Amino acid sequence: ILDTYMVAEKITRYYTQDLIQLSGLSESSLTPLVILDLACGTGVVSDALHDMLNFQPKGNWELTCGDISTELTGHVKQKILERGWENSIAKVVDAQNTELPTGHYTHVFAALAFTSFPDTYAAMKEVMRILQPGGTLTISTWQRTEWLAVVEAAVAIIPADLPFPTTKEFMSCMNPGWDSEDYVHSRFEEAGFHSVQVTTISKQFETSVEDLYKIAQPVIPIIVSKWWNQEQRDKYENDILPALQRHLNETYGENGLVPQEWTAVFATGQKGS
Ligand SMILES: Nc1ncnc2c1ncn2[C@@H]1O[C@H](CSCC[C@H](N)C(=O)O)[C@@H](O)[C@H]1O
Numbered sequence: 001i002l003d004t005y006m007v008a009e010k011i012t013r014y015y016t017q018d019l020i021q022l023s024g025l026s027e028s029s030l031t032p033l034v035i036l037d038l039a040c041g042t043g044v045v046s047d048a049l050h051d052m053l054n055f056q057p058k059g060n061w062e063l064t065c066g067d068i069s070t071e072l073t074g075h076v077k078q079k080i081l082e083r084g085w086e087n088s089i090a091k092v093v094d095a096q097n098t099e100l101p102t103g104h105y106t107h108v109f110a111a112l113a114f115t116s117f118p119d120t121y122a123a124m125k126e127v128m129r130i131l132q133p134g135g136t137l138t139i140s141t142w143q144r145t146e147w148l149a150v151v152e153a154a155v156a157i158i159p160a161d162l163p164f165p166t167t168k169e170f171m172s173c174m175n176p177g178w179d180s181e182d183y184v185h186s187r188f189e190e191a192g193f194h195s196v197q198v199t200t201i202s203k204q205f206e207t208s209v210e211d212l213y214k215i216a217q218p219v220i221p222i223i224v225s226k227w228w229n230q231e232q233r234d235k236y237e238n239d240i241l242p243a244l245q246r247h248l249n250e251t252y253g254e255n256g257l258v259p260q261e262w263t264a265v266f267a268t269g270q271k272g273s
Pocket of ligand 1: 013041072113
């Protein structure tokens with residue numbers, strides 16, 4: 001689990017500054033700040049919060065870093081000790097059942113996580129419960145990644161007529177709609193948030209062929225489970241990663257850098273006073 005997430009955090013860190021800006025955190029009048037990094041992964045939002053809030057003492061604001069994964073939580077637990085984040089606690093938190101206190105947080109952040117929750121309605125209700133009156137929820141969700149297009153190119157050089165999902169189909173297998181501004185906006189209002197703002201932001205970067213291969217590796221079995229039949233899996237499932245190796249090496253080289261543009265929906269809203 002953790003090795004894959006160390007590859008992924010090189011990318012998700014590019015989306016944290018806009019999340020924090022959209023939240024209004026810098027201008028917030030709520031004090032002291034009491035912040036949750038929900039589904040924190042390796043903690044990239046927490047990294048950015050400690051950079052922004054490094055003009056102030058540790059006692060003047062509080063941070064909880066919560067994730068369902070014990071392995072990812074342990075990584076953040078160690079980062080807290082290493083870097084001296086004395087105001088911060090990392091612990092296992094299920095977004096659908098947080099066990100966190102009612103009316104506690106001034107700000108909840110959930111970066112690139114809501115589509116992973118089997119019951120997003122339970123998670124939205126939990127966030128509304130654990131926010132203070134006047135508290136803020138700010139989230140990001142993927143609209144378009146481009147690692148998938150590299151796997152599609154690999155399947156295309158397997159010499160058989162094989163199905164492969166588009167960006168849209170892959171996004172919509174679990175929790176469709178969070179790639180749409182209007183859907184996300186409506187979800188915030190339906191959950192009880194006010195002063196909802198939604199926007200869409202792209203980042204342009206480069207990813208190594210080695211990193212693209214590691215991103216794709218755990219998702220290949222899911223892809224062929226959902227979109228291939230058993231005959232197709234029997235004959236060709238083990239051909240995908242070799243084809244991806246070949247595609248990446250021949251197109252970009254063993255240490256090539258693959259241009260990337262990924263786009264996310266950002267949304268924020270406020271609990272009533
Ligand atoms: N029910 C749940 N409750 C809390 N975290 C969950 C969850 N289901 C999945 N997750 C976590 O959601 C994360 C999505 S990856 C996003 C991680 C991080 N916020 C970043 O921007 O890089 C993973 O760390 C995964 O373990």
